[PDB]
Scaffold this active site. Sequence first.
Site, short mmCIF file in Angstrom:
data_model
loop_
_atom_site.label_atom_id
_atom_site.label_comp_id
_atom_site.label_asym_id
_atom_site.label_seq_id
_atom_site.Cartn_x
_atom_site.Cartn_y
_atom_site.Cartn_z
N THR A 70 43.13 42.84 39.43
CA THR A 70 41.83 43.53 39.41
C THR A 70 41.27 43.20 38.02
O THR A 70 42.05 42.82 37.14
CB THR A 70 42.01 45.04 39.62
OG1 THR A 70 40.73 45.70 39.81
CG2 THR A 70 42.78 45.68 38.47
N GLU A 71 39.96 43.28 37.83
CA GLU A 71 39.33 43.04 36.54
C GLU A 71 39.50 41.66 35.95
O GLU A 71 39.69 41.50 34.73
CB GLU A 71 39.84 44.12 35.57
CG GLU A 71 38.78 44.76 34.71
CD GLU A 71 37.62 45.45 35.40
OE1 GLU A 71 37.67 45.95 36.54
OE2 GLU A 71 36.53 45.52 34.78
N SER B 138 36.59 50.94 46.00
CA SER B 138 36.99 52.19 45.36
C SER B 138 36.52 52.13 43.91
O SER B 138 36.58 51.07 43.27
CB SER B 138 38.47 52.48 45.50
OG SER B 138 39.29 51.51 44.85
N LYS C 167 31.69 43.42 50.99
CA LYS C 167 32.79 44.11 50.29
C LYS C 167 33.16 45.24 51.24
O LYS C 167 32.68 46.38 51.11
CB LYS C 167 32.26 44.70 48.97
CG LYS C 167 33.26 45.54 48.18
CD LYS C 167 34.06 44.71 47.17
CE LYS C 167 34.96 45.60 46.32
NZ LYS C 167 35.85 44.87 45.36
N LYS D 266 36.39 38.59 40.02
CA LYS D 266 36.08 38.32 41.42
C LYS D 266 34.58 38.56 41.69
O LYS D 266 33.94 37.74 42.35
CB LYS D 266 36.84 39.18 42.43
CG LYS D 266 38.35 38.97 42.46
CD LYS D 266 39.00 39.75 43.58
CE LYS D 266 38.75 41.26 43.47
NZ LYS D 266 39.53 41.80 42.30
N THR D 267 34.09 39.73 41.26
CA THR D 267 32.66 40.03 41.52
C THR D 267 31.74 39.04 40.85
O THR D 267 30.80 38.55 41.50
CB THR D 267 32.36 41.49 41.11
OG1 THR D 267 33.23 42.31 41.92
CG2 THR D 267 30.91 41.85 41.41
N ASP E 149 30.33 46.63 42.80
CA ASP E 149 30.55 45.28 43.33
C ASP E 149 29.64 45.07 44.55
O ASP E 149 28.99 44.04 44.72
CB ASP E 149 32.02 45.12 43.78
CG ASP E 149 33.09 45.19 42.70
OD1 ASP E 149 32.75 45.45 41.52
OD2 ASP E 149 34.30 44.98 43.01
N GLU F 252 34.36 39.76 49.52
CA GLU F 252 35.14 40.04 48.31
C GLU F 252 36.23 41.07 48.62
O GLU F 252 35.93 42.06 49.27
CB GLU F 252 34.27 40.52 47.14
CG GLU F 252 35.13 40.77 45.89
CD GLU F 252 34.42 41.47 44.75
OE1 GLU F 252 33.18 41.57 44.78
OE2 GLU F 252 35.17 41.90 43.83
N1 LIG Z 1 32.49 35.38 32.81
C1 LIG Z 1 32.39 36.61 32.30
N2 LIG Z 1 31.89 36.79 31.06
C2 LIG Z 1 31.98 37.98 30.46
N3 LIG Z 1 32.18 39.11 31.13
C3 LIG Z 1 32.81 38.98 32.32
C4 LIG Z 1 32.92 37.74 32.91
N4 LIG Z 1 33.49 37.92 34.09
C5 LIG Z 1 33.72 39.21 34.27
N5 LIG Z 1 33.15 39.88 33.25
C6 LIG Z 1 33.38 41.37 33.02
O1 LIG Z 1 34.79 41.72 33.24
C7 LIG Z 1 34.85 42.90 34.04
C8 LIG Z 1 35.59 42.53 35.33
O2 LIG Z 1 34.77 41.54 36.06
P1 LIG Z 1 34.54 41.74 37.70
O3 LIG Z 1 33.83 40.55 38.22
O4 LIG Z 1 34.00 43.10 38.04
O5 LIG Z 1 36.22 41.73 38.10
P2 LIG Z 1 37.02 42.11 39.49
O6 LIG Z 1 35.85 42.05 40.55
O7 LIG Z 1 38.08 41.05 39.59
O8 LIG Z 1 37.50 43.53 39.42
C9 LIG Z 1 33.41 43.35 34.24
O9 LIG Z 1 33.02 44.34 33.26
C10 LIG Z 1 32.56 42.10 34.08
O10 LIG Z 1 31.19 42.38 33.67
MG LIG Z 2 35.15 43.17 42.00
MG LIG Z 3 36.60 45.52 39.54
#
Ligand SMILES: Nc1ncnc2c1ncn2[C@@H]1O[C@H](COP(=O)(O)OP(=O)(O)O)[C@@H](O)[C@H]1O
Ligand SMILES: [Mg+2]
Ligand SMILES: [Mg+2]
Length: 224
Positions: free
Chosen positions: A11-12, A41, A37, A15-16, A54, A115
């Site tokens: 996670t984090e 959660s 999606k 992906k989004t 997301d 996603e």
């Molecule tokens: N390429 C990027 N540059 C900087 N910030 C990023 C980048 N990718 C993700 N983020 C930040 O990292 C966090 C997790 O990204 P997110 O796409 O929501 O991850 P996941 O969907 O895998 O949980 C978010 O706060 C997002 O804004």
């Molecule tokens: Mg996500």
């Molecule tokens: Mg997330």
Amino acid sequence: SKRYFVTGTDTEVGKTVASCALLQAAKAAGYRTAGYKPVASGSEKTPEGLRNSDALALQRNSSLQLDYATVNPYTFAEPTSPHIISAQEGRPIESLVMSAGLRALEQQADWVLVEGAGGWFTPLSDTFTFADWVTQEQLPVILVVGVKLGCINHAMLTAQVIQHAGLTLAGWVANDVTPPGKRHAEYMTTLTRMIPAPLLGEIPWLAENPENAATGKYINLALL
Ligand SMILES: Nc1ncnc2c1ncn2[C@@H]1O[C@H](COP(=O)(O)OP(=O)(O)O)[C@@H](O)[C@H]1O
Ligand SMILES: [Mg+2]
Ligand SMILES: [Mg+2]
């Protein structure tokens, strides 16, 4: 019509953000797009009900004007595993409902991106995980890799299990979650060798609102 499931090394990891880049690239290519999606959660209240960030990003990045519920049928406020909060709130997550939602989007879109929630094996019930649903749908999988210490192991673990499930790893996306460090090129080379799928592109470190940054340009859809 074309359909992809997007998973991540954890996670984090992006992906989004990577899913938004993929959707922008598909619109640029002339597709009628939709992000989905099914399960989310970690969501905030609004007058219309709970809204997940997301799902909102996927909705905004879809070329079609879609209603929220069509993007995200299952929305939970607490940011924990879906199976835990689903059981606590007495709102079961049903594979059939998730699948019907994918079909609904396909009524209008010719390119759909799904996603996941968390990583590959995130539980949806005490006997069913997200991986189980993806396997049922036989979706081609795209792996998002957040480039950081530990990502090689996670990318390799995820790729191996997807392959063992008989699924196709359609590609991977490198996401630069932090500013550039010393072994970035070596890490990219290592991941490129080890992950058995095409590298679709690399999203740079974009501190401010990366979800709405113009990132389609970083994805080469012809490799997918
Ligand atoms: N390429 C990027 N540059 C900087 N910030 C990023 C980048 N990718 C993700 N983020 C930040 O990292 C966090 C997790 O990204 P997110 O796409 O929501 O991850 P996941 O969907 O895998 O949980 C978010 O706060 C997002 O804004
Ligand atoms: Mg996500
Ligand atoms: Mg997330």
